[PDB]
Amino acid sequence: EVDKRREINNEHPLLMMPLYANGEEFNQGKYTFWGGDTLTGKWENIPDDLKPYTVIQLHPDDLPKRDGAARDFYEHMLEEAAKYVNPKTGKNEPIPVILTVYTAGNMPYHTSAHWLSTSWIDKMYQKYPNLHGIFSTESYWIWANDIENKAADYLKVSAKNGGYFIWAEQNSGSAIEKAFGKNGKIAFQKSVDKYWKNLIFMFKNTPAAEGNDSTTESYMKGLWLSNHTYQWGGLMDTWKWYETGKWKLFASGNIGKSQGDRQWLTEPESMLGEEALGVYLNGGVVYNFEHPAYTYGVNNKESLLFSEVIKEFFRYVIAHPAPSKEKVLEDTKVFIHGDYSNKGNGKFFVNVNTDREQTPLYMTGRYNVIPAIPGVLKTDKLKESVSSSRIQIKEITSPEFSSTQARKEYLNKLYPMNYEGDIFAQKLDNRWFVYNYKVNENVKQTGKLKFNSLEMNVEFEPHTYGIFERISNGLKVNLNNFRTNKDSLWSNAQDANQAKKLPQLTKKGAIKWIEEHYIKDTQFGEKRVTKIVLRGIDKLPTIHSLSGTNNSYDQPSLNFDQKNHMVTITINSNGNLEFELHFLEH
Numbered sequence: 351e352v353d354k355r356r357e358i359n360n361e362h363p364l365l366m367m368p369l370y371a372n373g374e375e376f377n378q379g380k381y382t383f384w385g386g387d388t389l390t391g392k393w394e395n396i397p398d399d400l401k402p403y404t405v406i407q408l409h410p411d412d413l414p415k416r417d418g419a420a421r422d423f424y425e426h427m428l429e430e431a432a433k434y435v436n437p438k439t440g441k442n443e444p445i446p447v448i449l450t451v452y453t454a455g456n457m458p459y460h461t462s463a464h465w466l467s468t469s470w471i472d473k474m475y476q477k478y479p480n481l482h483g484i485f486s487t488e489s490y491w492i493w494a495n496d497i498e499n500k501a502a503d504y505l506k507v508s509a510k511n512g513g514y515f516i517w518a519e520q521n522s523g524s525a526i527e528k529a530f531g532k533n534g535k536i537a538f539q540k541s542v543d544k545y546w547k548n549l550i551f552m553f554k555n556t557p558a559a560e561g562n563d564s565t566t567e568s569y570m571k572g573l574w575l576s577n578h579t580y581q582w583g584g585l586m587d588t589w590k591w592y593e594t595g596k597w598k599l600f601a602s603g604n605i606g607k608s609q610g611d612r613q614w615l616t617e618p619e620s621m622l623g624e625e626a627l628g629v630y631l632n633g634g635v636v637y638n639f640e641h642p643a644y645t646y647g648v649n650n651k652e653s654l655l656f657s658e659v660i661k662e663f664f665r666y667v668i669a670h671p672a673p674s675k676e677k678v679l680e681d682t683k684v685f686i687h688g689d690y691s692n693k694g695n696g697k698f699f700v701n702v703n704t705d706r707e708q709t710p711l712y713m714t715g716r717y718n719v720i721p722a723i724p725g726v727l728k729t730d731k732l733k734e735s736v737s738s739s740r741i742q743i744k745e746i747t748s749p750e751f752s753s754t755q756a757r758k759e760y761l762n763k764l765y766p767m768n769y770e771g772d773i774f775a776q777k778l779d780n781r782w783f784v785y786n787y788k789v790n791e792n793v794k795q796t797g798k799l800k801f802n803s804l805e806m807n808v809e810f811e812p813h814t815y816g817i818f819e820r821i822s823n824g825l826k827v828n829l830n831n832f833r834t835n836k837d838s839l840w841s842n843a844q845d846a847n848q849a850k851k852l853p854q855l856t857k858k859g860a861i862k863w864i865e866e867h868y869i870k871d872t873q874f875g876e877k878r879v880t881k882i883v884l885r886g887i888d889k890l891p892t893i894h895s896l897s898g899t900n901n902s903y904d905q906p907s908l909n910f911d912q913k914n915h916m917v918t919i920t921i922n923s924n925g926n927l928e929f930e931l932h933f934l935e936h
Contacts, residue, residue, distance in 0.1 A: 715776025
């Protein structure tokens with residue numbers, strides 16, 4: 351093995367920072383990115399605490415579809431990255447880069463990435479120590495005849511150089527199963543047997559109408575636990591709102607795939623944190639987002655989604671490393687071997703732990719994410735682990751998985767019920783993680799959680815997650831319900847028919863909207879109420895270390911009922927929030 355260029359694991363997570371080449375300006379002799387970020391300016395802006403965990407991911411977007419264009423753009427940017435000087439110290443501090451080398455099946459009618467040979471990639475790794483890896487993303491809809499062969503070559507050239515091959519893909523059309531050899535294309539399967547320590551496999555939740563969120567995430571987790579990938583994660587994509595035909599928040603009717611640029615702006619900001627929790631709580635460590643103009647920002651400025659949700663979430667997962675592989679193995683009671691594509695795809699988990707066919711969220715944490723690997727793979731390495739002895743490894747074709755009711759009856763024997771209420775909750779050590787799982791329905795949810803004898807009842811509106819940590823002197827609370835008002839995008843449409851018919855916002859129009867109405871002059875959402883009730887408290891708790899999104903919260907209300915030894919906490923906010931409550935139990 352060649353020394354790794356960087357670590358990627360629970361203690362060293364990875365946030366990918368995408369930059370999409372502006373092919374129109376490339377044709378004019380300029381080297382620029384859609385949305386106006388510059389490589390140097392963006393890197394400088396990244397908070398210093400996050401720099402060790404963040405990597406710039408270049409994407410060739412609409413560079414001309416001809417030989418040399420992607421090499422030219424990429425070599426220019428690698429040079430800029432390599433020559434970077436820290437303005438505060440004067441030291442050359444090369445910027446870490448990941449290159450997108452494969453997308454859309456690398457068809458020459460789809461992408462300039464077609465004209466990037468393995469030879470060139472090898473040359474770039476050798477020339478640039480700051481090239482930390484290469485990325486393949488989104489070919490499930492165009493599964494090229496040689497995709498497994500090419501993926502084997504990407505993994506091998508990365509291993510040769512100590513870099514990572516990162517593949518973000520969704521199990522549409524059995525893509526993950528095929529990647530590992532379902533249909534007899536076994537080159538990548540063989541590559542992984544040798545080079546899995548240089549592989550990162552991520553879900554890509556874009557094709558949301560096909561409902562493969564839960565099954566793809568199950569595979570990513572299972573691949574990791576069984577030593578078929580070094581680590582896993584997810585690319586969470588606000589374009590899901592387009593794929594599923596949604597429009598104005600909470601509005602009725604479906605507009606189909608008709609208003610792309612309005613649609614990818616509409617997903618609530620905090621819902622990206624809800625999605626990202628599925629990665630974190632299950633031991634994933636790599637995070638990436640789309641659409642980047644919304645999720646990260648424009649013109650070297652952080653969007654509010656980035657500053658108030660993603661930045662804070664990512665800081666959290668650095669401060670509190672995700673459960674290790676060993677820990678997740680120890681906690682795993684059931685591990686599925688087999689193909690979800692033959693058991694209803696995402697339907698497998700509907701009314702088990704997801705509430706509908708098309709959602710990136712879960713409705714219960716009772717089973718967390720049940721890990722699986724495709725039927726083509728073997729569980730030998732999993733069984734060889736010292737931490738896997740109490741795992742039931744079950745074929746997906748087992749009678750236990752034959753129906754929705756069979757799945758719950760089996761899983762319920764092994765995963766005890768550990769909270770009450772119709773809301774998502776999952777416990778990790780002394781922490782309850784809670785969110786309202788509604789996607790586009792304006793419905794409050796409630797749950798009853800316990801920390802031993804201490805009872806905590808919560809009431810959450812949609813697009814609200816919380817982390818509640820029992821600490822020696824009381825409770826640490828992190829709450830995020832940040833959701834701005836996107837109704838302006840849907841002005842002039844009083845129903846779905848009218849909304850489908852709106853003028854296109856367009857790509858350039860959306861970037862302009864972000865500049866003019868999101869980066870500044872933001873239409874913030876209304877403050878909304880969260881209730882937390884604690885039962886079993888000695889005296890009125892005290893509040894400490896209260897902070898959050900500027901101007902986004904009223905002072906929390908503490909109402910102590912001495913007779914019933916209980917406190918009702920009322921919060922009215924829209925943003926991120928954190929505080930400690932100090933108290934003793936009764």
